[PDB]
Design a binder for this molecule. Structure first.
Ligand SMILES: CCCCCCCCCCCCO[C@@H]1O[C@H](CO)[C@@H](O[C@H]2O[C@H](CO)[C@@H](O)[C@H](O)[C@H]2O)[C@H](O)[C@H]1O
Ligand SMILES: CC(=O)N[C@H]1[C@H]([C@H](O)[C@H](O)CO)O[C@](O)(C(=O)O)C[C@@H]1O
Ligand code: NA
Ligand code: NA
Length: 480
């Protein structure tokens, strides 16, 4: 078994997350508290929270498996995510801040009209219900063979517990848990790397040389155009657009831009996040390369037909010492939970502003907004968790892959509003329609690589919403 000591580390970590939630529950009086944090978050904390929100068990498990089986080409993705940040700061964040947004999609009603706002908000909320279910599913897939408990108990520990502290704690409790979880997964990744270096005969130098000799850093055979394969050009355009989605059009990140009290602290949020993205992800790639060298030096330690997605967890549970092993498991929990908590709170912030407030005939009182803010964390939590239970016990993708395609059009709407002065409500709507059709064509009637779905979706809104602008009444002004 995992053992009592390893467990006690895990349950200490879980108890610490709940206690942070209890601490921040006292200050939740209004929706402003619960979603905007009353302007009490410093920049550095919001920036760690952005990193921990975006980096989930998807990165933690997949990126090492990917470097193990192939190469580091995907890391170009991380650096493109940093490269766009000044553009976000200069062109997007001033609108978000000056409008005193609760939900990012309020910008779309201000720039265009309610149809664009609601299309984007519903696509966000549905996508993130999926992201939570997926994050929870992968974590369970990773840990289940090695914990000695039923999948459902594991879901209680990963998901239910996360729901409780998120519910009590508001965006402040979500952010301060994220800071701990962000730093825990970061040190955890560094510590895994170190340990694998100490177990490879020849250490870090042999890990480097073997990897470079196998052409597993940046193979030039991947510098080629393709419509179907995930080559360097495809993933560069693909990650550029995914990153623009993540940092301009996605409520879980955009929410962190408005919790700081000044633009000075807002810059600190982006700067802190940039430092983490420039340093930490490299360790996840380095881990897959290290493990590859380690299991080439120790061929009999893998069962034949072992799934390469389980090699990292296999190494943790079989090769890391007692206490340390329990802490790495807590760090995988921390990668999952920091993303789950942010997605639940953002889902509730969108529901509160874009659905409940915007569509009520009269404006809800402060006390009413607070109630619904809390309630939607439970409801979304329940739905996300059931889905995760279904994914586990059965062996669905349709809904998820379908709603995922709406990320492109949501992101195009922001690019169009922000950069095309003549675009207007109607031309944005023609843009959505064109975008939707184009993405369904890409996904279901072609063999195009998945990296193209976002670019197509985005650029379809931009192009159709630009060329059809003169057919509708002149654009709303919106002067900041
Ligand atoms: C998915 C692919 C589809 C893309 C095909 C291109 C679609 C382009 C549509 C262009 C026509 C838009 O239709 C829009 O209709 C309203 C009524 O419908 C027009 O009407 C508006 O202006 C006119 C000016 O005379 C007024 O008489 C009218 O009362 C007012 O509402 C808008 O000026 C026009 O902008
Ligand atoms: C460029 C890239 O790989 N982006 C990935 C990011 C980054 O790894 C992370 O934000 C650190 O920069 O993590 C995810 O959002 C995640 O783990 O759920 C998946 C996404 O595909
Ligand atoms: Na996370
Ligand atoms: Na979070």
């Amino acid at each position: 078994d995992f053992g009592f000591i390893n467990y006690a580390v895990l349950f200490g970590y879980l108890a610490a997350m709940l206690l942070v939630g209890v601490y921040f529950s006292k200050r939740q009086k209004t929706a402003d508290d619960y979603f905007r944090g009353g302007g009490r978050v410093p920049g550095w904390a919001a920036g760690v929270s952005v990193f921990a929100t975006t980096l989930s068990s998807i990165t933690f498990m997949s990126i090492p498996a990917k470097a193990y089986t192939s190469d580091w080409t995907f890391i170009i993705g991380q650096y493109l995510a940093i490269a766009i940040l000044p553009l976000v700061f200069y062109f997007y964040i001033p609108f978000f801040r000056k409008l005193k947004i609760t939900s990012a999609y309020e910008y779309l009603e201000a720039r265009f009209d309610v149809r664009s706002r609601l299309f984007a908000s519903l696509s966000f909320m549905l996508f993130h219900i999926g992201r939570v279910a997926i994050i929870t599913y992968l974590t369970v897939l990773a840990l289940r063979p090695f914990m000695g408990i039923d999948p459902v108990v594991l879901i209680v520990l990963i998901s239910l517990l996360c729901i409780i502290y998120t519910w009590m704690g508001g965006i402040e409790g979500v952010i301060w848990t994220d800071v701990i979880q962000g730093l825990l997964l970061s040190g955890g990744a560094v510590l895994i790397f170190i340990m694998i270096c100490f177990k490879v005969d020849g250490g870090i130098s042999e890990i480097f040389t073997t990897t470079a000799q196998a052409d597993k850093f940046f193979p030039t055979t991947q510098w080629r155009w393709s419509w179907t394969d995930s080559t360097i050009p495809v993933l560069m355009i693909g990650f550029l657009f995914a990153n623009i989605q993540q940092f301009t059009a996605s409520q879980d990140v955009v929410q962190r831009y408005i919790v700081t009290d000044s633009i000075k602290e807002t810059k600190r949020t982006l700067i802190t996040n940039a430092k983490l993205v420039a340093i930490i992800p490299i360790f996840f790639f380095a881990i897959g390369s290290a493990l590859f060298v380690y299991y080439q030096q120790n061929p009999s330690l893998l069962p034949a037909g072992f799934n390469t997605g389980g090699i990292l967890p296999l190494f943790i549970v079989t090769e890391m010492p007692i206490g340390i092993a329990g802490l790495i498991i807590a760090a995988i929990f921390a990668a999952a939970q920091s993303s789950i908590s942010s997605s639940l709170n953002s889902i509730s912030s969108c529901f509160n502003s874009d659905i409940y407030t915007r569509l009520s005939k009269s404006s809800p009182s402060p006390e009413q907004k607070m109630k619904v803010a809390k309630l939607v964390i439970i409801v979304a939590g329940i739905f996300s968790s059931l889905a995760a239970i279904w994914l586990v016990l059965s062996d669905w993708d349709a809904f998820n892959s379908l709603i995922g395609l709406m990320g492109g059009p949501m992101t195009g709407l922001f690019m169009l509003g922000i950069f095309v002065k003549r675009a207007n409500a109607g031309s944005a709507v023609v843009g959505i329609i064109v975008s939707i059709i184009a993405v369904l064509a890409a996904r279901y009637g072609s063999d195009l690589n998945f990296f193209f779905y976002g670019v197509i979706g985005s650029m379809s809104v931009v192009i159709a919403g630009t060329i059809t602008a003169p057919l509708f009444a002149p654009a709303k002004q919106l002067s900041l």
